[PDB]
């Protein structure tokens, strides 16, 4: 559990980049 | 340990839900 629970934190984390990311662009 | 990174995870998931909803209103 620790070992899958570590990994989703930073697939979390790192589709959290790509959402921040996606708001910029879409930001006139 | 385990309750912590639940908690991380719970918060990094309502975090991307806000940002998902911000993407949403921006799209065509
Ligand atoms: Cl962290
Ligand atoms: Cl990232
Ligand atoms: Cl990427
Ligand atoms: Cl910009
Ligand atoms: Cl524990």
Chains 1, 2 share one sequence.
Do not use: D, G, Y
């Amino acid at each position: 559990q620790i070992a899958r629970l570590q990994r989703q934190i930073r697939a979390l984390q790192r589709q959290n980049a790509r959402l921040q990311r996606q708001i910029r662009a879409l930001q006139w």
